[PDB]
Amino acid sequence: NPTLFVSYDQNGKKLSFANWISVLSPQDTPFVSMTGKESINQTIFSWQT
């Protein structure tokens, strides 16, 4: 319908998204960063207070 110059009647438009997903969320892990690593074998031992 060439009746009027409008956009509602346009055939085959382009969706025109934005190429990014800013879904940022908090992830710090300060405790896990300031603890260390003490890899072990079993899972029933203790520390003998």
Residues near its own copies (CB under 8 A): 7, 10, 12-17, 19-21
Block residue for tokens 């319908």: 1
Which one, of 10, 33, 17, 24, lies nearest residue 2 by Cα? Answer: 10
Residue 28: CB minimum distance to another protein, A: 8
Contact by Cβ (8 Å): 1, 9: yes
Give whichever of 29 and 49 is closer to another protein, judged by the CB atom.
29
Give the interface with another protein as residue ranges (CB under 8 A): 1-15, 17-29, 31-32, 44, 46
CB of 29 to its own copies, least distance (A): 14
For residues 10 and 1, the answer to whether their CB atoms sit within 8 Å is: no
